[PDB]
């Protein structure tokens, strides 16, 4: 299947002379392998998947350097944006950066992205084609200009199109055991009456990887929707994911309703029905 490497940085200011908070995390598909964290006890880039504890002192001296670097630039940005937005020093504000790699089923480059937020809003971002920028608002425009002067798109692109894929395909190979699984969802369907004239049906997907999944519910043929509770997909904590879908149905008519599961591990899409 396709695969993807992503890095997520978050920097939060604190009122006054306090130092900001900084957090780095790096993922392969849906699997965290590295964290850094200013509030933590190490001030190094620490490992989180067992296949990355494989990497030697150099790798960890370097990443730590890269992380500290970003953090420095984040801390400066926070001062700047505060000016640009005309804001007191009383407030805690937030600065968020996502960037990374997508490769297709042959591990050839598919696409990449770089995106930066300020107080939960898009601020600036690299266009899909990795050459141009979208600036929300006119403080972003000042940035756009600065970053154009410094050929920032080119640099990021050279990374995205190169080392990022390079190393991803390394970690796929080093991670081969774990990262390269596809785990089909395990289903069941619970039935509990909620009145003398209605019953709840719940459709469960459990123990699947990666996260992307699609449960839905239909009555006769075509679909209910609106009428169905559906929890957002969630982590179980052992590197797999869960989700369920639920509709209340007229009691005694529960063998009209049917439930559909779609996922990459499932060669052929399941339709589940109350299985009493």
């Amino acid at each position: 299947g396709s695969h993807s490497m992503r890095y997520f940085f978050t920097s939060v200011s604190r009122p006054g002379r306090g130092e900001p908070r900084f957090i780095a995390v790096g993922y392969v598909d849906d699997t965290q392998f590295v964290r850094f964290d200013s509030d933590a006890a190490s001030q190094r880039m620490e490992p989180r998947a067992p296949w990355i504890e494989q990497e030697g002192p150099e790798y960890w001296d370097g990443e730590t350097r890269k992380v500290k670097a970003h953090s420095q630039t984040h801390r400066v940005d926070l001062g700047t944006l505060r000016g640009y937005y005309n804001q007191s020093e009383a407030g805690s504000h937030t600065v968020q950066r996502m960037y990374g790699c997508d490769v297709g089923s042959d591990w050839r480059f598919l696409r990449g992205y770089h995106q930066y937020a300020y107080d939960g809003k898009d601020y600036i971002a690299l266009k899909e084609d990795l050459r141009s920028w979208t600036a929300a608002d006119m403080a972003a425009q000042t940035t756009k200009h600065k970053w154009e002067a410094a050929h920032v798109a080119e640099q990021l692109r050279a990374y995205l199109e190169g080392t990022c894929v390079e190393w991803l395909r390394r970690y796929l190979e080093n991670g081969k055991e774990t990262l390269q699984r596809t785990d089909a969802p395990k289903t069941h369907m619970t039935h509990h009456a909620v009145s003398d004239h209605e019953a709840t049906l719940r459709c469960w997907a459990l123990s699947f990887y990666p996260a992307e999944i699609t449960l839905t519910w239909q009555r006769d043929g075509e679909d209910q929707t609106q009428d169905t509770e559906l929890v957002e997909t969630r982590p179980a904590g052992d590197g797999t994911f869960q989700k369920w879908a639920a509709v209340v149905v007229p009691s005694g008519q529960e063998q009209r309703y049917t439930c559909h599961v779609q996922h990459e591990g499932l060669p052929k899409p399941l339709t589940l029905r109350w299985e009493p």
Partner: peptide, 10 residues
């Protein structure tokens, strides 16, 4: 492997 190029003040 984080990027070492392309990250610079706004």
């Amino acid at each position: 492997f984080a990027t070492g190029i392309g990250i610079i003040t706004v």
